Amino acid sequence: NKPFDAFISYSEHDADWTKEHLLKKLETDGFKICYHERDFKPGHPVLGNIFYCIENSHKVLFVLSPSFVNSCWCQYELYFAEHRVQDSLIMVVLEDLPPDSVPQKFSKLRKLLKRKTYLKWSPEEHKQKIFWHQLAAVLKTTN
């Protein structure tokens, strides 16, 4: 029984979409989210380290796009979650990733993408409505 439903990570390039769509919808619908842009407090002994969100969240959710995979900072975030975290991972593909673009040593993300375990965003309202129900569903699954 973690206090947060998900720790969410996303690239700077995807920040506007994530805040305006993903975060807003999830929080309006009652999910409790931990994310560093809001919840990391530099110098705070509890809130100012990177273990806080992931240790207190049921799921880890990554927003995936080329900008995420090619970002130095996002690769560090991927490394951390891969080595800290399993069924607790949730991948949202916002934009298609070119084949073999994920660095070879990110075995977990590679196998998860290869095995089609992600949810994919769509521009069409009908597919988006399904997306949001399926995202809520996967956030509530066991680990």
Next chain:
Amino acid sequence: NKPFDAFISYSEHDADWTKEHLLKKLETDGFKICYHERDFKPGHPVLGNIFYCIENSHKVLFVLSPSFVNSCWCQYELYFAEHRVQDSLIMVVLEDLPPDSVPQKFSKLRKLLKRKTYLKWSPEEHKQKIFWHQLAAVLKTTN
């Protein structure tokens, strides 16, 4: 026989000092340095991932200060090096770290600081001259 003598990591707050003093001196004196601000190439299959510098550098050098320890991004960099890398680590204390400020789960940095294995910067020219000779010395040690 690695192509780079060191992969160097430093906080945004310390970027001016690191480029103007550490990087300039080391490169003027013949050391070959890998650091992401210059050498990470987004999207490049070889140069656009975080494993390139560390895998091709003899040493890993961190510039330490409160701004480093309290930075979300620097904590991710610390996690990566701690789990990837041992004698290959080199800590340069640019500014004193308050006691117990390093998050508890960074065991390696904590034990290394506790055991006084770092080099400390000084404002005094005489101590700086010694610092630079000692930094060159430690960069050339075996791993």
